[PDB]
Structure 1
Amino acid sequence: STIEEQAKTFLDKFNHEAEDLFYQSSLASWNYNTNITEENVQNMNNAGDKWSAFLKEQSTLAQMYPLQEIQNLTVKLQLQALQQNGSSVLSEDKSKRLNTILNTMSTIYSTGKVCNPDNPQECLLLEPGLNEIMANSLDYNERLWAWESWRSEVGKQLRPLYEEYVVLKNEMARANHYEDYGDYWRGDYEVNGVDGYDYSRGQLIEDVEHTFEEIKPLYEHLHAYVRAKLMNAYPSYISPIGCLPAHLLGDMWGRFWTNLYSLTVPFGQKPNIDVTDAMVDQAWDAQRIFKEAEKFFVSVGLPNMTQGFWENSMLTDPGNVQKAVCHPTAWDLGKGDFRILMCTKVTMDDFLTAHHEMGHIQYDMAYAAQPFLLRNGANEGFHEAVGEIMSLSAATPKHLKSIGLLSPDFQEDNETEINFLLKQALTIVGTLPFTYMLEKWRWMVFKGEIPKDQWMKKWWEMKREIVGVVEPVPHDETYCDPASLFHVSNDYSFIRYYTRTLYQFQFQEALCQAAKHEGPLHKCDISNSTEAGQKLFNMLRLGKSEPWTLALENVVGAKNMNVRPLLNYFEPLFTWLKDQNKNSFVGWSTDWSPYA
């Protein structure tokens, strides 16, 4: 018989014999991420090794079947992924050190505690504390201490580990027909089989820069408006021509400018679009947040959350009795098990991210019908963009009024929309320069364009030029500040978040055409529209099977990321920002530093 049919029965054996092995690893990994114990770290690692062993053996058997013979393209994708040699190309010397480093960096970031210089026994951890300091404090010194101490006491220790991480990871990617570890991540966006819908590793790197060029003007006026309004909040510390000190931004790294909304809110007297106060004053629970997000997906026709979701998920901090990984995580364990692990606090940020993570599950539930090796999103951005479609509709003041977090007699206004659009711009527009710089640094470091002696110089050289953020304190090469972020320290691709935002409005534009709309791209609550939901269901059901370019084309009408929908969503803000900067300087000077 045909080898293609011979390989089909090989994959049929693989799919049926792999689910339990992957399920056991997922169960153990869930039991450690929800319960930090040395007993669970061994059990989770053992199940991962058995899962990895099953991958290694079934990969070698998959090498025998040649891809060039197979003509069923969906079969070709499944065989192609299983045939790939990942860490298997590494020797036992290389694989152990690569994994020993990777776990060590995660444990340093997780167990990172900064002691108060006075009373050294008092230590502040990044997750419970030292983020409240970096997101609620208006003291320049308190923010400076938390920003510098984390990037020095925790970051410096990650500097030696990251250098060996790059060289070992590069050897893995270079061995497996890639230029560098950046190319290994960059292949996620590649299509090479269908005419007109093909893609390449470098087409991402050129489209990102072309699309970012049209985001820079909007960022400049957002920067200037924030700069002026931060100048009042922190007098005598910010230059009206210079960059923005890093610790004065929203969070520990400047990734999100959301927390700056209090200082930069245009019209304070208009009712707050930040319903964080309203939730707490109405005794909103963690359950209500995930239940309200459930009703949103139900209204557009998508299914209820499974009973395994409500029974088995962890939606609150378990307490000081048992530790947990409180990074918002969506789990597709398999076997119909869908769970969300999150340290939900009653804030608007966790309300929107609950919609984001339930968007992950809705995507995960839809592609469950597809085979195991096709059980994934079209690309990384697609998965993260699906959740953001919901949080884009859920954040609208009309939807907030619908759920009761805004007054029943709320009257829309020109001023309120600027209040709403600015807050959405701090979260969405603000992070785009941060993501472009962070991945460009990592992409170039993997390529070797940035030498090890010029690592930190380039990190803050680009942060000033691209993002407009300056170092509050001079930093040597001993510091390793890029690894002070979770995503860099835990070996995750970060360009997914930049591509996410451009997809998000492209989908919403099409979803808000199916749901008969009247006005602009904002005020786009797809809630109660079954047509909008079924337009997404078809994309979610495909998974990795169809190419991402084709998947995008059927939904929105284009084979590539288009920055135009994003600019139309924020167009009322862009024009308002330009007038609000008539007497302010737009742009930043690359040579101003607070320490100078």
Structure 2
Amino acid sequence: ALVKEEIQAKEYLENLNKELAKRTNVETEAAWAYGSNITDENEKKKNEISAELAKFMKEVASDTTKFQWRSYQSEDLKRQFKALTKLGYAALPEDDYAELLDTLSAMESNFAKVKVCDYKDSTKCDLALDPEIEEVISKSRDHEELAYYWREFYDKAGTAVRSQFERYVELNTKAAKLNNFTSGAEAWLDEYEDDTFEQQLEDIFADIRPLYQQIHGYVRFRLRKHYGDAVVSETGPIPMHLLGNMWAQQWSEIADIVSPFPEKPLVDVSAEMEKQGYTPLKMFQMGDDFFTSMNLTKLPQDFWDKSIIEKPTDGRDLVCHASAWDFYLTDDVRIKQCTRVTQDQLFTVHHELGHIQYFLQYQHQPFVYRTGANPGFHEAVGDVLSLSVSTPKHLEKIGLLKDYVRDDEARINQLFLTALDKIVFLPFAFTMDKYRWSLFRGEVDKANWNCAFWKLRDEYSGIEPPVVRSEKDFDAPAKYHISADVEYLRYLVSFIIQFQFYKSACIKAGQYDPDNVELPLDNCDIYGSAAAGAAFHNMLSMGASKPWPDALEAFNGERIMSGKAIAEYFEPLRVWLEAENIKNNVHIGWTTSNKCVS
């Protein structure tokens, strides 16, 4: 009978989950050691442990077939079994899997070890993306210096790993097919448990695109005044090196030159942070307080004892790209961040602690449920906090923003500043996976791989490289997530749903009322709101125990991903900006780039 078997299956899963947690802990420790300290020895060990765990998961997947799990009464038991049948890369033959792991570490270590020569001193060649090159990209307003660093970085982080990247695409596809997905794209998209999810994102992106065009237009207008028409054309894509960021994913670093009201306050608290003697530790402590102020969980002692919150000053190599780690025990959670004392880094700290909070909130769950309701939820949690941290309201409370008058013009400056990060990023994030999906699905010949990348960056974002690229270059792996094989759609989803979360949390905190000019959504601070916190607790404690619409329902009673909340946030900006572009006769739209030669 199935009644007796379903009772046995329940005990089988209970023991197996605990075993998976314990085995993954060993892999996670080895991965943590590699990322904190990149050596051939640590690579070998990371990859050998993973291979062992891969082998064990194969065995588990095979063992699921001895249970009639699809026949069971429990949706919960069925959901857990379904999770165990999904092997990912672990479906590959032993040798193929090992080759893949060597390929991935080759790519991530290459990215992490990139060094460029100083623009002004080619004897000094120890400049790393983080912090040296990123400091320049964000601060320099010398367009030739900007273009020099762009070309050096992209040549070393991108083109250098073309053949490894090709091999990864093959093995990624092979793995997906061994799981009976058409490609890696369907493998990634499976995490969202919704067969119309791509179309949903297309619909939502289409609604926000006109606002992005207006922002793009206005920024291009303002850059022309700064750099002149020789550097920036009216009708062409924006030279991406002028946008304050190596990938042009967010443009807030050039707010000083494109802000709507240059003679009104622009929030940039980096200087005050330094003046008040802030450290990385202080920044994490403040993030902690934010979470505990909402009646959420305080960081445990293991976090403080084991996290790395500053770039090491010994000679070593490591992955500085920030990350949050769950070791699947109790309270062993850590962050690795090469923290700097700046405004953007304060937001990052809160973002990462959102990951840590999710880990702590679902650690009581069975292992297979110890992850986000979908990858987007995990990325959204901390960003909901960063939105209120970013408000003048909050920055005044913590004494980082002084003598701030919030008149109508300063409001527009702050809305635009936020848009430069929140709206600008949407097309960027969409293209990161549109590109990889197209490679995974076999839609682009290998001979056209680099111009397929720049073509998407043009079509959706209206940016282009500073210099002519060709199919001799290979520019995509210059983005961390592309070198490190991290699905990027999570972030598009996060930037949409975080405003659904933020809006609802602000309403619960009494911080937003649409019909009250004193409680605007763009100045809501949820700090200290236990109502807000309760919503977070209800959602986050579920982990992946239910499909994501049930997790959203737990937060605010909604079950649909919607662009309504983000549009609602920026509606005051849209009205103002549309009128400002008309007043200044701003050209909108762009010609096709001439920057990637076939």
- Match of 1:425, SS? helix
Q: 2:85 matched to 1:83?
A: yes
Alignment partner for residue 416 of structure 2, among 412, 422, 430? Answer: 422
1:262 aligned residue:
256
Provide closer, same or farther for how the CA distance between residues 506 and 472 of structure 1 changes in structure 2, counting only shifts above 3 A. same
Q: How does 1:348-497 map to 2 (within 5 A)?
A: 348-407=343-402, 410-497=404-491
Provide closer, same or farther for how the CA distance between residues 252 and 397 of structure 1 changes in structure 2, counting only shifts above 3 A. same
How far apart are the structure 2 equivalents of 1:34 and 1:497? 24
Alignment partner for residue 223 of structure 1, among 198, 216, 223? Answer: 216
Cα deviations by residue, 1:185-234 (Å, 9 ceiling, x for unpaired): 010101xxxxxxxx21xx11111111011111110111111111111222
Alignment partner for residue 133 of structure 1, among 136, 152, 156? Answer: 136
Provide closer, same or farther for how the CA distance between residues 172 and 40 of structure 1 changes in structure 2, counting only shifts above 3 A. closer
TM-score by length of 1: 0.93
Deviates more, 1:486-495 or 1:315-324: 315-324
Q: How does 1:536-555 map to 2 (within 5 A)?
A: 536-555=536-555
2:241 aligned residue:
247
- Alignment check: 8 A CA contact 2:14 2:366 kept: no
How far apart are the structure 2 equivalents of 1:539 and 1:499? 16
Provide closer, same or farther for how the CA distance between residues 410 and 114 of structure 1 changes in structure 2, counting only shifts above 3 A. closer
- Match of 2:127, SS? strand
Provide closer, same or farther for how the CA distance between residues 137 and 548 of structure 1 changes in structure 2, counting only shifts above 3 A. same
Deviates more, 1:309-318 or 1:393-402: 309-318
Q: Which one-letter code corresponds to 2:381 in the other structure?
A: V
Provide closer, same or farther for how the CA distance between residues 592 and 321 of structure 1 changes in structure 2, counting only shifts above 3 A. closer
How far apart are the structure 1 equivalents of 2:48 and 2:173? 26
- Alignment check: 8 A CA contact 1:472 1:593 kept: no
State the 1:472 CA deviation.
2.4
How far apart are the structure 2 equivalents of 1:68 and 1:594? 53
Q: Which one-letter code corresponds to 1:485 in the other structure?
A: K
1:62 aligned residue:
64
- Alignment check: 8 A CA contact 1:300 1:532 kept: yes
State the 1:435 CA deviation.
1.2
1:100 aligned residue:
102
State the 1:159 CA deviation.
1.7
Cα deviations by residue, 1:440-470 (Å, 9 ceiling, x for unpaired): 1221222222222222222222222211112
Q: 2:176 matched to 1:173?
A: yes
Provide closer, same or farther for how the CA distance between residues 155 and 287 of structure 1 changes in structure 2, counting only shifts above 3 A. same
Q: 2:516 matched to 1:516?
A: no
- Match of 2:334, SS? strand
1:589 aligned residue:
590
Alignment partner for residue 504 of structure 1, among 494, 498, 507? Answer: 498
**Root mean square deviation, CA, Å:** 2.1
**Identical aligned pairs, as a percentage?**
36
How far apart are the structure 2 equivalents of 1:219 and 1:267? 19
Q: 2:43 matched to 1:41?
A: yes
- Alignment check: 8 A CA contact 2:47 2:98 kept: no
How far apart are the structure 2 equivalents of 1:89 and 1:165? 15
- Alignment check: 8 A CA contact 2:137 2:146 kept: yes
Q: Which one-letter code corresponds to 2:161 in the other structure?
A: L
Q: 2:538 matched to 1:535?
A: no
Cα deviations by residue, 1:336-370 (Å, 9 ceiling, x for unpaired): 21111111100001101111111111111111111
Provide closer, same or farther for how the CA distance between residues 314 and 85 of structure 1 changes in structure 2, counting only shifts above 3 A. closer
Provide closer, same or farther for how the CA distance between residues 155 and 332 of structure 1 changes in structure 2, counting only shifts above 3 A. same
State the 1:88 CA deviation.
4.1
- Match of 1:127, SS? helix
How far apart are the structure 2 equivalents of 1:568 and 1:121? 49
Provide closer, same or farther for how the CA distance between residues 213 and 313 of structure 1 changes in structure 2, counting only shifts above 3 A. same
Deviates more, 1:145-154 or 1:73-82: 145-154
Provide closer, same or farther for how the CA distance between residues 35 and 165 of structure 1 changes in structure 2, counting only shifts above 3 A. closer
State the 1:331 CA deviation.
0.9
Q: For structure 1, which runs of at least 5 residues remain unmatched after alignment?
A: 191-198
Q: How does 1:168-247 map to 2 (within 5 A)?
A: 168-190=171-193, 199-200=194-195, 203-235=196-228, 236-247=230-241
How far apart are the structure 1 equivalents of 2:54 and 2:170? 22
Cα deviations by residue, 1:410-467 (Å, 9 ceiling, x for unpaired): 3321122112111111111111111112211221222222222222222222222211
- Alignment check: 8 A CA contact 2:100 2:168 kept: yes
State the 1:14 CA deviation.
1.3
Alignment partner for residue 340 of structure 1, among 324, 335, 339? Answer: 335
Q: Which one-letter code corresponds to 2:398 in the other structure?
A: I
- Alignment check: 8 A CA contact 1:89 1:176 kept: yes
Cα deviations by residue, 1:469-511 (Å, 9 ceiling, x for unpaired): 1232222212111121011111111111101011001111211
2:147 aligned residue:
144
Q: For structure 2, which runs of at least 5 residues remain unmatched after alignment?
A: 514-518
Q: 2:286 matched to 1:283?
A: no
Provide closer, same or farther for how the CA distance between residues 505 and 124 of structure 1 changes in structure 2, counting only shifts above 3 A. same
How far apart are the structure 1 equivalents of 2:184 and 2:480? 18
- Alignment check: 8 A CA contact 1:182 1:443 kept: yes
- Alignment check: 8 A CA contact 1:220 1:586 kept: no
Provide closer, same or farther for how the CA distance between residues 144 and 462 of structure 1 changes in structure 2, counting only shifts above 3 A. same
How far apart are the structure 2 equivalents of 1:49 and 1:308? 28
State the 1:153 CA deviation.
3.6
Q: Which one-letter code corresponds to 1:177 in the other structure?
A: N
How far apart are the structure 2 equivalents of 1:453 and 1:45? 31
Provide closer, same or farther for how the CA distance between residues 525 and 588 of structure 1 changes in structure 2, counting only shifts above 3 A. same
- Alignment check: 8 A CA contact 1:245 1:594 kept: no
- Alignment check: 8 A CA contact 2:221 2:586 kept: no
State the 1:148 CA deviation.
1.8
How far apart are the structure 2 equivalents of 1:584 and 1:595? 30
- Alignment check: 8 A CA contact 2:468 2:595 kept: no
- Alignment check: 8 A CA contact 1:4 1:69 kept: no
- Alignment check: 8 A CA contact 1:3 1:69 kept: no
1:193 aligned residue:
none
1:569 aligned residue:
569
State the 1:301 CA deviation.
0.7
2:516 aligned residue:
none
State the 1:322 CA deviation.
4.0
How far apart are the structure 1 equivalents of 2:32 and 2:461? 37
State the 1:593 CA deviation.
4.7
TM-score by length of 2: 0.93
Deviates more, 1:147-156 or 1:421-430: 147-156
Q: Which one-letter code corresponds to 1:548 in the other structure?
A: W
Provide closer, same or farther for how the CA distance between residues 410 and 123 of structure 1 changes in structure 2, counting only shifts above 3 A. closer
State the 1:592 CA deviation.
5.5
- Match of 1:440, SS? helix
How far apart are the structure 1 equivalents of 2:282 and 2:264? 26
- Match of 1:570, SS? helix
- Match of 2:244, SS? coil
- Match of 1:426, SS? helix
Q: Which one-letter code corresponds to 2:541 in the other structure?
A: R
State the 1:594 CA deviation.
7.8
1:195 aligned residue:
none
Q: How does 1:310-349 map to 2 (within 5 A)?
A: 310-336=304-330, 337-349=332-344
State the 1:5 CA deviation.
1.6
- Alignment check: 8 A CA contact 2:18 2:367 kept: no
